[PDB]
Amino acid sequence: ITRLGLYHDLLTVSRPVFITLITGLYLVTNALFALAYLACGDVIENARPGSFTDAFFFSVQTMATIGYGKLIPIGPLANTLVTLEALCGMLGLAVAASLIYARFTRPTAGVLFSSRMVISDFEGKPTLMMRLANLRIEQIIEADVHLVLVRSEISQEGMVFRRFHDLTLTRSRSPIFSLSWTVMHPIDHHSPIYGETDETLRNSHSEFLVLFTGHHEAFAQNVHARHAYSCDEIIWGGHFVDVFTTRRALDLGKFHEIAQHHHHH
Amino acid sequence: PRILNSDGSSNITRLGLDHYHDLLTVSRPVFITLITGLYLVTNALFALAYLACGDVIENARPGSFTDAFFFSVQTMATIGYGKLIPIGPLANTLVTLEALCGMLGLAVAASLIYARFTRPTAGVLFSSRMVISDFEGKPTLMMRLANLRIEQIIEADVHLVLVRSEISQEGMVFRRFHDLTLTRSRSPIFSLSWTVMHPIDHHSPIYGETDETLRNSHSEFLVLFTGHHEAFAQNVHARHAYSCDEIIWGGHFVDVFTTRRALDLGKFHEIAQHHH
Amino acid sequence: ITRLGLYHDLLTVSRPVFITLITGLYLVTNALFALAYLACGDVIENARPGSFTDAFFFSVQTMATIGYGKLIPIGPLANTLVTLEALCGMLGLAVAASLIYARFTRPTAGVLFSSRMVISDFEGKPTLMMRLANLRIEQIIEADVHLVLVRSEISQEGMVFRRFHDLTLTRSRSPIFSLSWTVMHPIDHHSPIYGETDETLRNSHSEFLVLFTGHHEAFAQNVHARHAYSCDEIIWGGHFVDVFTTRRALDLGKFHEIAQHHHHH
Amino acid sequence: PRILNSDGSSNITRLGLDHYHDLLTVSRPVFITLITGLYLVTNALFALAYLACGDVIENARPGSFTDAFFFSVQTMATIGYGKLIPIGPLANTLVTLEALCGMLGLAVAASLIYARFTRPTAGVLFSSRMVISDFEGKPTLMMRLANLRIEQIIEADVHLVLVRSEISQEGMVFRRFHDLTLTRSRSPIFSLSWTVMHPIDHHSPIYGETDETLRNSHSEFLVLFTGHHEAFAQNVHARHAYSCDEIIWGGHFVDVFTTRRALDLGKFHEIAQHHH
Ligand SMILES: [K+]
Ligand SMILES: [K+]
Ligand SMILES: [K+]
Ligand SMILES: [Mg+2]
């Protein structure tokens, strides 16, 4: 949806990219300090005068507290920039190990959603179904799923607006979620999609959110995934194909396979 | 006098009553003062103690604070440049004590910094006022909240609680909480703006109530908001409370979605009422 | 209850005591390493021979990576104990900052329980009550309380055993818990203590657990407290005294005050 | 063949399929190998690279691994003893790169070590077998669990789930979960031993079921346990699964509280049945 109007770029991207961004910050800080050492004369013993190289590889050994010995500071000016850079490379370490420990605990759910939903007959009634799989060895316990219809309806005083329905499922918790789960909304008289058709959904501008949480044994943290389906992505009459080949195996290759009947025109 | 402040904090003086919470919830610039600050005064206290035991620093100029201080720094920080060095068993004691102080120091810092980095504000703006006005032909208590960020808040939960003085048969006067039922209390994706609605049916504890009856019971309304911030991959909490004098009877919130399809949060607190 | 039968002392005590325990571990490790430096001859340049002092204050400067310069190692023996002690004082730092960060997130609830319960008439019915207070400025949100009766009853085939009841409360959640909360179990016909008396509780060996949780704004963590009452600690006819003096104040001095009527013998 | 292993892990081969999880859940001695190990091979790789650019270490003996290696150590660890020093702009590059490697190294270590220190096992022992036998005159499916630690587990929750093959009218054969109701599913203080009981009333999905009927549906029972460990001030999870052949029909668990008032967990898995 398009926006309107009314430092904080605390962002986490690729692992390679993160390691460079942090390499980068370590250099430019070392350079800013080198500059400043030169910018009070030449206050580094054993340092070649009017050199960046020497005052930089001094900062490095001061921020990293290597303190190697040869390159030391000279009386009260550079001994002030040495106490400021001691702090910077101890806060620097703390922010780095923050971001690191943070990133190590912002974990992906590794939950695969079926490419489509189906409406087809299960225990006597037309039933809206979709399925999700765990892409990992490590189990997800206390896993809950919500299947929410959102669509356009009208009120008494017009103001024609957007309503949410939490579709009753045959089962909304998987006590351990390990392999695959087929989430089923039976379409009985109570259902907000009773009597509805491909066309009647399309008109109401009907979408289905599948919202998924569980506790991940992998991360010892709670984990979240969602997916949205349009009327376009429901195969009326479709049956998901068994993904459990027999000896007991689970083929995620069959995960998005749906069997429909085609009619003898 | 408000029993609850706007911000849902309690407005009641406590009696019969180290810190921590202040370092976490203080400004980023002010924090960076207090650690730089602690860092100087510990280097000072250690410089003093070195001088308190004579000329126990190699290549120091004697009875000097600057020399011993900028020695402390290089020991605490484990720089140990190797010119300004300690002397025999008097100083070398303080140098082991100080090495600890600047490894525990580092540990406390990373703790605070991580804590701070993972205690994030909800993006959440509450309407300044509530309204009672027809919705589906019934009087309906409403307020609205908005997400001030691009990043959605997932699996978002809202509670609207009446708190009011009530008298028993036994004539005990006590405060009672009520969780007003809402036409919708959940938002799967909360991205823009959400109007929360308590239909005042027969079951509602404010059925047949008026601006005057609410005022008598000292009625207050606490809004509680939670959800999951995909910004921070953490759960967020926001609360807000309203007094009687913050209900516009007959108010209607003005549409906040202007046109090329836009959310004007300038209009967010705007309420239209009819006048006579 | 008395026990029967069938390294891991990961314990957290006083703040002073914790700081010494960690001081202590830093010394004895430094001493164990000093010993070992002496235990391969005298392999420390500029170090007074057959001295503990010198080889200890060398370990310190090697484990702490001060590396001061004067005291260095001598060829392949002590250069092996220098790489082992580099690791020890980087794992040492990690365990220390672990324990520290851990302890900074094992926070006390600061929930005060009333010294006694009362049974007295509230909205028409005898009502078992007790109260709890927050001892802190920082609010507790999403606070839940359980009040559980445990007592001795008999089954059909004897095996006379110990049953739990979760007493219905007038309100078991405090949406924000800031000041004080009076938790009330109305004793109606459904109640497991309907018709019961001081004596009938005593016989059944009846105890009441009050179990309390909420999310602490202070710690951004979940927080837990419990308390158990015996039949002995119920004041039949007692009314808690108002702790809100009027201008609005909360006196926790009145917290444990209970008003009973005494009878004109 | 078990669909679920005893330990509640899934016993099914996966196809259509860096690490992390291995460092957290491996032995304490083996972990301390792998970090010492990583530490040596990185010092080696850095020693090699120093020698790959000639005699760029002061006071080193030339074409030497030990000298450059024990230089690496003193740089990575930021000891920098100040004798074994680097030479001009070739090495001094590798010395800045290496200073990083041993600050990120430290950060990864503290991460793992904290993670490990706060991922604690539940103290929990499950009975090896379940039993069906009269309790309050009804057949009753039972198992029991015990706390192997002194420290109570608070606000403890137990789920007992039947999982079995079922056929629809449409003749689709599928696996169905059922949450069997228990006489008690909560334990406020869980300190000793707890017998969990599914009365097999008319409502139970195993009403009128027999060892033979359960076997046909390939019935399995998953027990799920959670609570709050006052040991670790964290929540703990434990699961266990049983097959049909692990139900003793007519079994009764033997009392585990011997006498001076004692819990003999030797008796924990003991079941008494009548014989003919
Ligand atoms: K040095
Ligand atoms: K150093
Ligand atoms: K040196
Ligand atoms: Mg150092």
Numbering used by the authors:
A (entry chain B), C (entry chain B): 23 to 28, 38 to 277, 282 to 300
B (entry chain A), D (entry chain A): 12 to 28, 36 to 277, 282 to 298
Describing publication, verbatim:
The inwardly rectifying potassium channels (Kir channels) regulate membrane electrical excitability and K+ transport in a wide range of cell types. Kir channel activity is controlled by dynamic conformational changes that regulate the flow of K+ ions through the central pore of the channel. KirBac3.1, Kir6.2, and Kir6.1 channels are homotetramers of four subunits. Each subunit has a transmembrane domain (TMD), containing an outer transmembrane helix (TM1), a selectivity filter (SF), and an inner transmembrane helix (TM2).
The tryptophan at position 46 in KirBac3.1, corresponding to W68 in Kir6.2, located at the cytosolic end of transmembrane helix 1 (TM1), is highly conserved within the inward rectifying potassium channel family, suggesting that it has a critical role. In this paper, we present the crystal structure of the KirBac3.1 W46R mutant channel (homologous to the human Kir6.2 channel) at 2.80 Å and provide a structural and functional characterization using a multi-technique approach. We grew crystals of the W46R mutant belonging to space group P21212. The structure was solved by molecular replacement, and a final model containing 279 out of the 301 residues of the construct was refined to an R-factor of 22.2% and an R-free of 28.7%, with 99.3% of the residues in the final model lying either in the most favorable or in the allowed regions of the Ramachandran plot. The mutation replaces a tryptophan residue that is highly conserved across the Kir family to an arginine, disrupts the contacts between the outer (TM1) and inner (TM2) helices, and creates new contacts shown in our crystallographic data. The atomic structure of the W46R mutant shows that the four R46 side chains point away from the channel pore and are engaged in intersubunit connections with residues Y38 and D36 on the slide helix of the adjacent subunit (n − 1: counterclockwise neighbor chain). The interactions between the flipped-in W46 residue and the two R134 and F135 residues at the bottom of the TM2 are lost in the case of the W46R due to the orientation of the mutated residue R46 toward the outside of the channel. The HDX studies show that the only region that is less flexible compared with the WT structure is at the cytoplasmic bottom end of the TM1, including the R46 mutation, suggesting that the network of interactions formed between the mutated residue R46 and the slide helix increases the rigidity of this protein segment.
